[PDB]
Amino acid sequence: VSNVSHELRTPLTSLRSYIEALSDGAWKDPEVAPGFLKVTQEETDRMIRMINELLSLSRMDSGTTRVDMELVNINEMFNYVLDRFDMILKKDDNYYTIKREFTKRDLWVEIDTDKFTQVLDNIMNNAIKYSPDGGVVTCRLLETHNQVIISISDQGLGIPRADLGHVFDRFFRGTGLGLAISKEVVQMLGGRIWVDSVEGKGSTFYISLPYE
Amino acid sequence: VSNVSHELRTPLTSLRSYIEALSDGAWKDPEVAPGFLKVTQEETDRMIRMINELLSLSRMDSGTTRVDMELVNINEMFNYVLDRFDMILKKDDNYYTIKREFTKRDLWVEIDTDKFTQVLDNIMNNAIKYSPDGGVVTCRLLETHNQVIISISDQGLGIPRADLGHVFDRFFRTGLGLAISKEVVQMLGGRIWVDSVEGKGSTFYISLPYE
């Protein structure tokens, strides 16, 4: 599409600029060279991600993806993920807190650990990105009906109620595929994923899993 | 589809390696840094081209590509392209010759100068790259029947007659230049094809409506 290849074109040409800058001499100058190099690094990793997600949406949707399913404890799992995010957030130069509300009963669900961790990641990420003033990101885990409900909420920028359903279609606004990922994955893990937001009260992404 | 994302994945991870190398300190060292940067440069430009080709087949497949058609002199045109290639080959640190045989009647055809230039380029490229022992790349331009015939030949590695037809199918060995040229020429209302004998050589033909 004019869309995808151009959305790949952008960081490429970006990279081209920084690289050109170094090549023409910037590499010799210590005031800019590490910095420019860092930008190049980031752009590259970004593109590898975009590529990989593109690929997973090629193999998952079209649709031959071996999904490694284990009976995992989501209490621990969610705590691991949130730990990693707390670690990235505490070494920042800006500012974010993680408000955990996990039920006191240990829950076990049939999920792919790696693919679900990539889910939780993508959603936490998109949350922090739609929360410009910072503050608290709220993460809940509790059961109902034999749904295990994970919910992740930000009190940042709202989300248009006119477009609330299409957040899960490909590239709806660090890559812009994380939602497509999580939706597809969760759907495959046999759960349901959706969003509820009031502009600009805040945003909340829901995940539901078959409990037993 | 996994193919495309793998052919994009490779130079990316390449880039990652070189970039990482520099970032960890290589930039401070003058013996490797210009060189590593040259690699990064090349890989990046490469990826941009691959993107563009992908995109041109995205607009061509869906036929959403306005092809800017002019009545051009292919004699001069081919001479321009071959001039550029002669400059590229003469400013090299390695070996290649351009054998021009252009008919002495000036021919004019309805073509998109730029897209046909990318054709001639892609094919000349496939010639120079597929000529491991080096030597001469042969470029002919002559009319027949009201065909304008361009032919470009290399005396390098042959091309298997068992798979000789699929050189123009998507991603047969950036790796899309052939798909480009084929599609473009078809769109310019001409015909494109290949004839090769391993390992005598390879020869790409282009035919255009002459009048």
Author numbering:
A (entry chain B): 386 to 479, 483 to 561, 572 to 610
B (entry chain A): 386 to 479, 483 to 561, 573 to 610
What did the publication describing this PDB structure actually write?
A typical TCS is composed of a sensor histidine kinase (SK) and a cognate response regulator (RR), which are encoded by genes that are often clustered in the genome. Modulated by stimulating signals, an SK first performs an autokinase activity and phosphorylates a conserved histidine in its DHp domain. Here, we sought to determine the crystal structures of a WalK homologue, lpWalK from Lactobacillus plantarum, which shares 60% sequence identity in the DHp and CA domains to our previous solved smVicK structure, in different conformations in the presence of ATP analogues or ADP.
The CA domains reach out, causing the ATP-binding pocket to be positioned further away from the phosphorylat­able histidine His391 in the DHp domain; we therefore defined this structure as representing the open state of WalK. The structures of both CA domains are similar to that of its close homologue S. mutans VicK. It is also similar to that of B. subtilis WalK. The major differences were the positional shifts, by up to 4.6 Å, of the loops and α3. Indeed, a global alignment of lpWalK with the open chain of smVicK indicated an ∼4° rotation of the CA domain relative to the DHp. The DHp domain is sandwiched between two CA domains. In the open WalK structure the DHp is completely symmetric, with two straight α1 helices, whereas in the closed WalK state it is asymmetric, as characterized by helical bending in one α1 but not the other. We observed that two straight α1 helices of the DHp domain from the open lpWalK were randomly bent by 16.7–26.8° during 50 ns of simulation, indicating that the bending is an intrinsic property of the α1 helices.
